[PDB]
Every structure is written in C-alpha cells, then in structure tokens.
Amino acid sequence: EPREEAGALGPAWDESQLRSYSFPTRPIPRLSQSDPRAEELIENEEPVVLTDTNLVYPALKWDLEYLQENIGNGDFSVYSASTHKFLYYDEKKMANFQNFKPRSNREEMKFHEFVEKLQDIQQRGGEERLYLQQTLNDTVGRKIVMDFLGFNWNWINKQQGKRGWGQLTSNLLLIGMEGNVTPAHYDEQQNFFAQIKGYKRCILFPPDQFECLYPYPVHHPCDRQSQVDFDNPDYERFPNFQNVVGYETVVGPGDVLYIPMYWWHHIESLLNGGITITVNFWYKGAPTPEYPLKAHQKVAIMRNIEKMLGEALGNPQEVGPLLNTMIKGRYN
Amino acid sequence: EPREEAGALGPAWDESQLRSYSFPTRPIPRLSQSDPRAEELIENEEPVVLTDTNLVYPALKWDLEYLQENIGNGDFSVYSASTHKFLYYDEKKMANFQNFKPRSNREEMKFHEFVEKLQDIQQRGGEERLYLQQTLNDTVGRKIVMDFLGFNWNWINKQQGKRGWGQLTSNLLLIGMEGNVTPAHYDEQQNFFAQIKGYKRCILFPPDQFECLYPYPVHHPCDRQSQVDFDNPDYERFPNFQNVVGYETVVGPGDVLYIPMYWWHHIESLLNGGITITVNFWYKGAPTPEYPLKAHQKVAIMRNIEKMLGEALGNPQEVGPLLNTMIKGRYN
Numbered sequence A, B: 001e002p003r004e005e006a007g008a009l010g011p012a013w014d015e016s017q018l019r020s021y022s023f024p025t026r027p028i029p030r031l032s033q034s035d036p037r038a039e040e041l042i043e044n045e046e047p048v049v050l051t052d053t054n055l056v057y058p059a060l061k062w063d064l065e066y067l068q069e070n071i072g073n074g075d076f077s078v079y080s081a082s083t084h085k086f087l088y089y090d091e092k093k094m095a096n097f098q099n100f101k102p103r104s105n106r107e108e109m110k111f112h113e114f115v116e117k118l119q120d121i122q123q124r125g126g127e128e129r130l131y132l133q134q135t136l137n138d139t140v141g142r143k144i145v146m147d148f149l150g151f152n153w154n155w156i157n158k159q160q161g162k163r164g165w166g167q168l169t170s171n172l173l174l175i176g177m178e179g180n181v182t183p184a185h186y187d188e189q190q191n192f193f194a195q196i197k198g199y200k201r202c203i204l205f206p207p208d209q210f211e212c213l214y215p216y217p218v219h220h221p222c223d224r225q226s227q228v229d230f231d232n233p234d235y236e237r238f239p240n241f242q243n244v245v246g247y248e249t250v251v252g253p254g255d256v257l258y259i260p261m262y263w264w265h266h267i268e269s270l271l272n273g274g275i276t277i278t279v280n281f282w283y284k285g286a287p288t289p290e291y292p293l294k295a296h297q298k299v300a301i302m303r304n305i306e307k308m309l310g311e312a313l314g315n316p317q318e319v320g321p322l323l324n325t326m327i328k329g330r331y332n
C-alpha cells in the first residue's frame, strides 16, 4: 500500500492506478544496502528492493527536457504497441514460424522527434503507447556521459565480485508512458533494475512456476515469454495458471530491484503517473560447479533438450511431434 | 496359408494352430539367397525369408535325444513362464523400479534335467512353459561343435562384409515348447533368425510404428518391449494400437528370417507342433555417416534423450515429470 513522500506531498501512488489480475501476490522486502538480510537474499537468489544504493544518483534529475537538451542528436530505437501490451519478438527466429506476423515494431528517430510524437499521443487520447531503449555509452551526449560516470560503480563492481558473477554484459535505459505493460518473461542473466523517474509495478514469479506459466517453445520468436494473457487467461489450455502466486512491489526513484536470473517478471507503469525512466544492469551468473537440482537448472536442461532436438532433427517444427511421441502412453 | 512338405506328407501346419489378434498383417516375401530381390530387401533394411542358405544345414538332425546324447554335461539356462507369455527383464534395471517384481525366472540345469522337466509338463497338461538358451561355443560337447563348424560361415561372413556391418556379436540357440510366445520387442542389432526344428510364427512391425506400440521407458527393466498386451489390448491407454499393421510369416526348418535392426518382432511357437529349435545370429549395424531422417534414427534419439535426462537429473524417476512439464500447453 502507497508510500508517503517527504515534505507532506501525499501518497506516491494509490491502488486505483494498479491493474487487476487473477492471482494472489505477496511483497518483496525493501531493505538497506547495509542490512545483512539484503546480502542474504541476493546470495540465495531471491529478489529484494535496495532503497539507498545511490546507484543512479545523478540521473534523478533526468526528465524529457533535460534529456532533449543534453542527450545529443544520435538516433534512438523507439518501440510502439497499439494496446498497452508490448509484444516483443526475436527477428532471427521468424524463419522457423511463418504464421508469426510482427505485432509491435521499432522506429528510429532523433530524441526530440520521439518527444514530439509522445506528447502528441497524450493530449489526444491516442491508444498508442511507446517505449524508448538505449544502451548507455560514449555514443551519447557529453553531460549524459558525466551523469553515467557518476553512477555508483563502486557499489556495482563490489556486487559483481562478491557473488562471483561475470562482468556487466550490458545496461539499458528505458523511458515509458503510463499504462505500459511488458508481459511476463524471464532472462538468463542476473538483473539490477534501477528506477529513476516515475513508479513501476513489478510482479515476479520464481523459476519453479515454469509449469504455471507456459513459455513459448524455444524456437518461437517469443521464447522466454509466457503464453498466458494475464488480462484474459485461458484456463482450458493453461489450467495451472490458476495456481500461480507472485511476488510484487512498486519501485520508485532511487530504488533498485534485484531480479534474480530465471525469475519471471511482469513490469507495468502505473495508470496515470506520467512517464517512467529506468536503467537495468545485467551480469552473467557464476558458472556451475552436485545435487539435488535447483529449479533454474532444470529449466536450462529443458531449453537444451529443445535446442538439441531442433538440430538433430534438422527442423524446429519436428520438435513437438517427437516429444509427444516420446511421451504418450509411456510417461503420461 | 500352410506349406506342403515333400513326399505327400500333408500341410506343414494349419491355421487352427495360429493365435488370433486384433490387427491386420501381410506376408513377408520368401525368396532364394540368389534372387536379386532378396539382396535388395536386406539392403533397404526390410525383412525377407531366405529359403536355401544352408546356414544351419548340419543342425537339421538336432532333436532332444541327439542333443542329450551329445551336448555334454555343462549347465544350461532354462527360463520358465506360468502362462504362454515369457516376460523378460533386465536385472540391472530393477533398482530404478522397486514395484517391479520378477514374473518369469531362470533356472540352471544339466540338459537331461531340462529334458526330464519338459516331458513331465507335457503329458500332465501343465500350464508351465519353458525356453532353453545357450550361446554356441567351444564350451559345448564335441559333436555339437562339429555341427556348429559346418554352418555356412562363408554365406554368413559374405553378408557381414557386403552390408558393411560390424562383426558377429553373438549367437544363441533357443529350444521351445508349443504354445510359447515371446512378446513384441525390438533389438538395436541386425538379426538372422535360422529355424532348425518345428515352425515359428513371426510378426514384425517396422520402426515407424513406435507410436502404436508403446515401449516401456528406457530405465524400466522391460526396456524395448511393448506395453500392449496383444491378447487383451487396452485401447484407452494405448489408443493407437488400433492402427497397428504387421508383417508376418511362418518359418520352418532351413528357413532364415532377416529381422532388420529396430524392427519390432513378436515370436510364437504354433499351438501343438511339438518343440522348436532356432539359432539367431546378431551383428552390429554399419555406423552412421545427412538427411532427412529414418524412423530408426529418430528412435535412437528418443532413447538418448531419456538416457541423458536420467543422468542429468540424478534419478530415473524424475524423467517423466520433466518431460510432461516440458511438454504441456507448450507442444501439445
């Protein structure tokens, strides 16, 4: 339930700006970077919200004006969806499935063009929604590079070492519009999700809920996303979505959410809070050293069987018929 | 339909000595060793009966007296079943499945003891049935070794080379009683089945009928046998056994049946013909050299996935729940 901002300025959000769903949730713990319980959650690959890392301190001033004015006239990838749901897809995997037609889609543009096209949509009710995505690097304007240089690298490098993770594999700046949903998917990397402006609602489900969540086949362009439409679940095809339980929280500026590798996450911008900015940091996990097996490890074995079988068979379409044949009246 | 033996001695068998089954069959071709069509069937891994190889010529005189008198007082593995069906099992795999209790079972004995125990059963209606099994080698009596030395090794070595097979991996002498059934199973090796005395009815199904035939899981002691009881099929659990079509023939003395690797075979001694003797010869196939894929190759891939997954998971019992999870609502 809503958090009270300093200086008597009222609740940060109210529950009328959250969407409704069929399943129960419980809260993710908010803690201090210095609380041993925090380090104990990360260590066990459980999510925690850290409230005082200062990870993105100098980015707290970012808004659209400040960015238009300083980010420099390179081109930026802007994605569009027609409803509130952003459907993403791996273009490389479209060969495999020719009845897949693009749903969301990408435009390039200068930043001010994006801004122009944004404010346009707003004060005309347009149902269109946008997300901007940019890796932070030297290819962006000087002031923004100064801002990026003052992030808490010392905090963020200490975590890389401590956990025995590999190196930062990438990072990504996301700017969104109120109402935006990124539907449930999982990633193979460890993720710190650093909120900068606005509030985001994050629903998480652990690896052992694979069976409730029904990911697309590995060769499908939506590999790692869930087949279940949360807004209208088909209990006939996905009967165990009825048993799903999630973990939830609302992050705001200066909060950092740890999304452990293979954890499902569903991410939405509140209804009517204005725009959101977020930066994610991704690390490869520690490599595998052995029993008895964690859920994430059994997920990787499923992925691998589906990948080998695609190869051995010479064609991704035969994967399903083989698995069924293997089975049917034998293990079911 | 029955074959007429030389010297006006009547039909070899009549159709009243064949058991009834739910499925249709068509005949396996009988041909001469010198018929090019014969070599063309073997070459394509299709079954054929060869009528004049003389493979086991000197064994045609074998019967019980001649064997008791000459086979020498080593010990011989004799198997017993209580019905007509011999259920076989791999003892090594029983750890995995503790609710499996032995059904058929093995006794050692001198040959004359086996003979004694045989004739006993006969003229007292006993429902018990026996099969004797012995590898042919120097460990057996001198005359039988002379007989074995006069087999058509020249024929049998030429086939080994021609097909590009590996070497003879083994051979096996089987002596059976009328009414005996060995239920449907497959082998990974190429098999020449050399009939010596009595008549055997052989029903074969190719590799692509895997889906109709419902083999036990790979870690089960009855790996490679069919779950379907042919005498009373459960169409609810095995619905596609309804679509099974087989190939059939009745082999008699001097006939050689080629059972190609991975072909299901069901083998039964006619009702009331007396005892049967058979010798099988097994070769490893040519190794794999590549598309698009034969049924036997897709069968091997199924076996391998089930074996890897047993290992990766640390326990054979988890194989099924993983495959289902992999698956369910995803590929079905």
Ligand SMILES: O=C(NO)c1cccc(O)c1
Pocket: A174, A181, A182, A187, A191, A193, A259, A265, A267, A268, A278, A280
């Ligand atoms: O999938 C995401 N992080 O892993 C993400 C982060 C911010 C906004 C959003 O819509 C999605």
Ligand SMILES: O=C(NO)c1cccc(O)c1
Pocket: A172, A185, A186, A187, A191
């Ligand atoms: O939302 C993601 N992971 O949690 C994700 C995955 C791959 C690329 C990417 O840009 C984002």
Ligand SMILES: O=C(NO)c1cccc(O)c1
Pocket: B174, B181, B182, B187, B191, B193, B259, B265, B267, B268, B278, B280
């Ligand atoms: O399974 C067999 N050969 O592969 C076989 C051969 C002769 C009799 C018999 O009952 C079985």
Ligand SMILES: O=C(NO)c1cccc(O)c1
Pocket: B172, B185, B186, B187, B191
């Ligand atoms: O009947 C068999 N194959 O067709 C078989 C298989 C393994 C051992 C054996 O003695 C016989």
Ligand SMILES: [Fe+2]
Pocket: A185, A187, A265
């Ligand atoms: Fe994500």
Ligand SMILES: [Fe+2]
Pocket: B185, B187, B265
């Ligand atoms: Fe066999």
